[PDB]
């Protein structure tokens, strides 16, 4: 039975849709789902999507509550749709994908990923659900994730972290490290060697390397000297310049974290979704230095210095392609006389 | 199974809720219920009530599609709630009653009318549904309707017409004449002898007596002379005066019908519900004569002349109580020297 | 006391705001004002305006229920605001003017028209309300209407018809013919001699002259011959051509009425407001002849033939200015060899 | 005068409805009440309830701003309605009860609690308002709270804390400790001896006993040894297990507080209302350990250990009834060989 | 090109409206503007204003992103409208002014401030935009701000802080100190000598003087003794009294900050806009002491003590006018025998 009342029953008694039988009273008002508990209406769900409220409620109740790849990783892999599950985008507070396969009658384009309509679409397959590995094998286009090895397919190790109920974490009691496989037009693709962003947060930033600890603790000159980073414009690219009315650099999240612990500032996420590179409207509350569009990428500082030391500085201006999160990120690089002047993502 | 999808399935395949099993895709947008037919959304229901859209949709799907007493009759009998059915008010486009008994989880105050909560409420019982006569017998307060005789209870013959799917009609293939019984505080009440309104419409007005035919066909003086109605101000009470900027009389629907066939006018029903007496904002398009509040009652012309000839005209001003539609309607009467000056309902 | 509950009380007991004391329960849902009558919510008002629902409800309750100039006349006179009344636009189902003077706290720009803010605005004054003639005398900009003569001011006779509760009518029991006065920058203007549109309707079109009766009754050639209208393209300008996929002519409402009685067609009023000239998307249901933009003006046929016979036909193409409804309407005229080819308003 | 404008005036000039005279401009948009201050609209109220926006605004303005019993206590006492006041549920952001008595015309079922309709309902009476003690005496069903002794009635001492403007606090300048009395069917009931929850918060958790201080400061083994809690599964029931993908225990708020100070986690309150026992969707951000439904009760640690030491551990599995917050809470208890295996509320 | 799609393009690619060419897909749902990024809808804007969603979106995109005077300063100067810019009120999340000049077609009253309609309005002119100084010179009513000196006009130095993207700050990399000029009826006014509020926040309160540091660090008696503040009721006016159920004093934000660092409390801003004096519904969480209306002004403590020491205490009760933020604030002062009893703003 697929019903709004049954979905609300599952949400009330299980926190999510568990497939139980039963129904509860449901009232739908402007864009909100309420249920009656002890004679009063209690809000169950508030629709922040562009879908109808009941459709969005059902998709949210049937979201995957296991660790899943972050939405940015799936986007960079060209995933169009998930097989028999809902990936919830907690940054957008909406389903990650427009259509579903065997989830909701109002959004399903098919009941199984084997149907003809799904063949041109890149379908996401979870190897932790039984049978989906074979579905990926028979799939024309798809991306498979597994927690272990798959016979006949060369794995690609993904990021250490994954999303669990909207919380990005590196699993200890649960496994968040996935092997990734991709098939295009029926043939397996070799996923390129890639860096991965750390998916950290400005407020609760925590270093993940000795170099990051030194960056957060040592002064600018002290840290630059210790890791012999002279000539790579670290004072501008990473630390950030606040002397002018226009903010300079601050293109890595670790620099923003250091400044934020030094002094608060305002970040305006004018495109609130998940991406490898984020653009912010930053206003430095201390000096008044601002930048309408600042590009920030949360690479590990070791990975960033390794990337920036692998580029010859004999070109005055160029665009460098770095494979991060399974996608090619374009960094604009300006150099002067063998030393970096600017290096920022787009 | 009580579900929005099942209710929509019944509406799609049966026109109303028939209790069938099955479900259809449902989308709920601003205040409208849509279903997907051949890949496109088709509007099933538009909520014009103050209830939540899904609740109103379910109550509308479970409305009584048999001939039922008009809403005004039930209101005048003090009915608060119906037993195991929904009376739909088609003039208000809403349920006739706030709560239900065994219909909708969001509106039910009880599952059966025998519960303690229903005892102080006047419950409507339909004798055409099996077992409800005994429920009325055991009921503390209630109004029962039957199509035949009930042993041990003296019947009260109601109006000839009843409402079927919002259409007021005197039944030929179906029975619309009901016997009415009432119990207050556990004791049967004797319903008073009463007149009944005809529930006719201005545009499709059709006479129901020879006197009404004469009124619609004969001129004012000719008709007044034929039925010796001199001295009862029929030229003002019924025919209506349009010589002044303020409209005069026109307090019976038959007079409005005669004028409307003579010349169109505007009626504004500023309280759009069902009542024995209706108040209108009338604008005569021909002369510009208007009245902000005009009281109209649709009595049979024979009944109205019988009522007006039963009142002595020796009182300059008084209020007369006439039992119409099982309720006491107050007519303001002004007389001068033994002849009527004004006689209008309130 | 200015209150939503008091306004609803006045609407319930008087049909409009009469200034009575009292209050009724009010519920405001999505864009609708309901009141509770006998325990059920009855819709009082539905907001079709861009104003807040309560503001629009109060403005609608305080609308002028006397005969007032049609909205198009007030627009052509440059009226910006009314003094101490609300002109309701029944075609738009909205107030005729954005602001008020002494009506609603949420829309008032002033409490009296004598305040400084009202001086640059053209204020509408009604001579039927006591004291407003003197307010017009002291007004810097304004338009005054009276039912009689005003000492020291030369009157301008307006149209015979006026709007009463949204119904356009020529008054018999009430006076709808107004004298118009205008003051700009503190000096009285002489309103030009003007024609007036008839404000008639397609469905209930009724001729108002012997020439119009002949047009509706006589055939095209018979009528053209009778009134010696040869050479003025009446077969195209007025009667309308349906032989091609693009509709021809039909620029006067009387021609549309004749065709409509001959055969129905679709009129799409894509700018649903009141104007001297209306543009329609017309689809002839009989032949399929259509025109995306057809300009229609409802002049009296005698006035139209008088206008068209007063223009020399020696110019191949020109624009003619005709003062209609106190505004200059531009007619595009094309002639060939002394006879009219096309003559349509804009 | 009961008016939306007067209610808004009181909110603007007093923060709540104080009964003052006056009115301010009010605009109602989608579900929000705005007022005009210095020519711009300022939001006064946003409707998060299922009531109409104006009704909810009036009920919110007339909420009780004195210390009142928490909503969970009133629910456990079977309170259906308050006498002449509004209890606001700040967790639901809505009135605690559907109907009122002498508050709002749109929600009142009666004007005084002495009316017949209120007799079957359990009415809440406040002894701090003059005359309500006698109303409780004459009441058939009701719950009375007082700050002092009541002659002829044996008091029941309630919790130390009460809610003041949505803030749970133990009063110092104000009295938050109430004596509770209950009458059912006209006869006074003896409220059972009960424990009370502490109504504390995870983020601002503060210990209220030496045992709680030891729990928050001492390690798990150290604290268990100090209070000889061996054999009662405190390492699982209270501290919480994070070694598996499914979270274990953590059924008391003090354990959640200790973990939260140790490391942050996500709590999803999928039924956001006030209850003695709360169910959460908990995701441990450190280990990834999660539980869809975790039952949490905020008892004082001394009370919890007293309860758990009063149960014989000779039953492998049973349900224990503990009277907390004037209601019987069911704890599922599993024991093995005289020592607790699991003990969690429902 | 002025278009919703172009405005959304500028917001997506620049964070604000920069005047670039291009368009992006836009979807408008209930009160929200979404755009499609990588096939999914991403919320760009949520309308919290009383304007139409697209109008509010365009006004928000064209807001001034340079340091601007705080909204309270502009209100106190009588500013009605800005010349060719949008001042965004971040506290109200709405435009600071109802109309615009050359910004949005739906809100413009003029395209340039030189038009006749703008003459009676006080127009805000920014001297950092080229040509606006001359516009102020030719303006009849206006307020001009400059970063430097203006020939022929005596400057008035404003507050040190200004608003940048909603963040109040004293600029270091950018200039936030403005000279203010005012013209009324075409003649330059001499702005009075004034104090300025500090626009600080309760949570992130930071002292700005040695006296404020002493107040936050020293005890009440110690601080009062150090600055010889005996006899001015500092223990009540500034520190706040929590011994009674009604909160006492606490009329300066520094006292609230000291208490908040001592113990949290609830502030309810029932009129959430920007003013020199703010009214709060304060509930002290520690003692339960509350006050429905508490007036708070964020003056520098040095300025407040200078003001309070400049008033003779020989009057039992009076109203004192202090020019703060270019407006006269009325302080109610009660004294007893030459010492202050109460001194609070209104």
From Swiss-Prot, chains A, B, C, D, E:
The record marks 295 as: Uracil recognition site. Homohexamer. Plays a role in viral transcription/replication and prevents the simultaneous activation of host cell dsRNA sensors, such as MDA5/IFIH1, OAS, and PKR. Acts by degrading the 5'-polyuridines generated during replication of the poly(A) region of viral genomic and subgenomic RNAs. Catalyzes a two-step reaction in which a 2'3'-cyclic phosphate (2'3'-cP) is first generated by 2'-O transesterification, which is then hydrolyzed to a 3'-phosphate (3'-P). If not degraded, poly(U) RNA would hybridize with poly(A) RNA tails and activate host dsRNA sensors. Likely affects Nsp15 binding to RNA. Its cofactor is Mn(2+). This is Uridylate-specific endoribonuclease nsp15. Residues 206-345 form the NendoU domain. It comes from Severe acute respiratory syndrome coronavirus 2 (2019-nCoV). Changing residue 236 to A: Complete loss of NSP15 endonuclease activity. The active site is at 236 (proton donor), 251 (proton acceptor), 291 (for uridylate-specific endoribonuclease nsp15 activity). Residues 3-63 form the Nsp15 N-terminal oligomerization domain. It catalyses: uridylyl-uridylyl-ribonucleotide-RNA = a 3'-end uridylyl-2',3'-cyclophospho-uridine-RNA + a 5'-end dephospho-ribonucleoside-RNA. The record marks 291 as: Transition state stabilizer. The gene is rep. Residues 64-189 form the AV-Nsp11N/CoV-Nsp15M domain. It is found in: Host cytoplasm, Host perinuclear region.
């Amino acid at each position: 039975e697929m019903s709004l009342e049954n979905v609300a029953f599952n949400v009330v008694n299980k926190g999510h849709f568990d497939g139980q039988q039963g129904e509860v009273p449901v009232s739908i008002i402007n864009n909100t789902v309420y249920t009656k508990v002890d004679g009063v209406d209690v809000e169950l769900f508030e629709n922040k999507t562009t879908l109808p409220v009941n459709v969005a409620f059902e998709l949210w109740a049937k979201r995957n509550i296991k660790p899943v790849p972050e939405v940015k990783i799936l986007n960079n892999l060209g995933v169009d749709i998930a097989a028999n599950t809902v990936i919830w985008d907690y940054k957008r507070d909406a389903p990650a994908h427009i259509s579903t396969i065997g989830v909701c009658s109002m959004t399903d384009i098919a009941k199984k990923p084997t149907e003809t309509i799904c063949a041109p679409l890149t379908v996401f397959f979870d190897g932790r659900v039984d049978g989906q590995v074979d579905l990926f094998r028979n799939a024309r286009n798809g991306v498979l994730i597994t927690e272990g090895s798959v016979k006949g397919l060369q794995p690609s190790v993904g990021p250490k972290q994954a999303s669990l109920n909207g919380v990005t974490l590196i699993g200890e009691a649960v496994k968040t490290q996935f092997n990734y496989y991709k098939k295009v037009d029926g043939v397996v693709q070799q996923l390129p060697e890639t860096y991965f962003t750390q998916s950290r947060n400005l407020q609760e930033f925590k270093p993940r390397s000795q170099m990051e600890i030194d960056f957060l603790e040592l002064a600018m000159d002290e840290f630059i000297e210790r890791y012999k980073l002279e000539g790579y414009a670290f004072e501008h690219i990473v630390y950030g310049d606040f002397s002018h009315s226009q903010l300079g650099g601050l293109h890595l999240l670790i620099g923003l974290a250091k400044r934020f612990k030094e002094s608060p500032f305002e970040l305006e996420d004018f495109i609130p979704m998940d991406s490898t590179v984020k653009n912010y409207f930053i206003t430095d509350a201390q000096t008044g230095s601002s930048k309408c569009v600042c590009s920030v990428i949360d690479l590990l500082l070791d990975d960033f210095v390794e990337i920036i030391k692998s580029q010859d500085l004999s070109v005055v201006s160029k665009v460098v392609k770095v494979t991060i999160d399974y996608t090619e990120i374009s960094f604009m690089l300006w150099c002067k006389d063998g030393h970096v002047e600017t290096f920022y993502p787009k």
